[PDB]
Structures are given as C-alpha cells and as structure tokens.
C-alpha cells in the first residue's frame, strides 16, 4: 500500500530498462571478465492424481 502511494505521488515510479551493451556483450566471462552469467529459464511439468 505504501509503495503504491509513492507511485501515485510520482515519488517512485514504474520503470523497465534495456541492458547496457558494454555489459551484455561480455557476459559469461568474455575477454577475461567474470561473475557475469546470463539470466535463464525453462519449465517443470508436474502431476496431479485423483481417485473414484
């Protein structure tokens, strides 16, 4: 609730940003760099069972 109030107020507002090229380009240790892995994702596939 407090956060929404600050948003309404224009004090703190919703944002999204693209990555700097200077950082994105050298991800995963390119050219001697480190501690910079790509963000990643996949899926699960779970199960649910019933009985009569």
């Amino acid at each position: 609730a407090e956060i929404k109030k600050q948003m309404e107020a224009g004090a703190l507002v919703e944002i999204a940003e693209g990555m700097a090229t200077s950082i994105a380009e050298l991800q995963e240790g390119f050219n001697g760099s480190t501690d910079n892995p790509w963000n990643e994702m996949g899926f699960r596939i779970d199960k649910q069972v019933i009985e009569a």
Partner: protein, 53 residues
Amino acid sequence: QINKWQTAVKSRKLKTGITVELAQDLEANGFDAPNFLEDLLATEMADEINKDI
C-alpha cells in the same frame, strides 16, 4: 652422390574473436564483417609468414 635435406612441416596458428555485437556494428558502419574477420587473420598470418621467410 645423392644426399637429402629434410624437415617436418611446422605450424602457425592465429585467432581473433569478434563478438556478435561487434560484427553487427561493423556491418552497420559499412564493413563486411564476416569477410573483415577473415581478412584480418589471413593478412596478419601472411605478414607473419613474410617475417618468417
């Protein structure tokens, strides 16, 4: 008399490594990026061959 002069062939090896972002910028800026890389290595190697000879 017949004598022989022999030697094994020896190797030279070069690599560059151009990021995809760099290749894209090279294309945007008027450079044939995939051929640019090959010319860089081929030229550098050929120059090193001349130095060796």
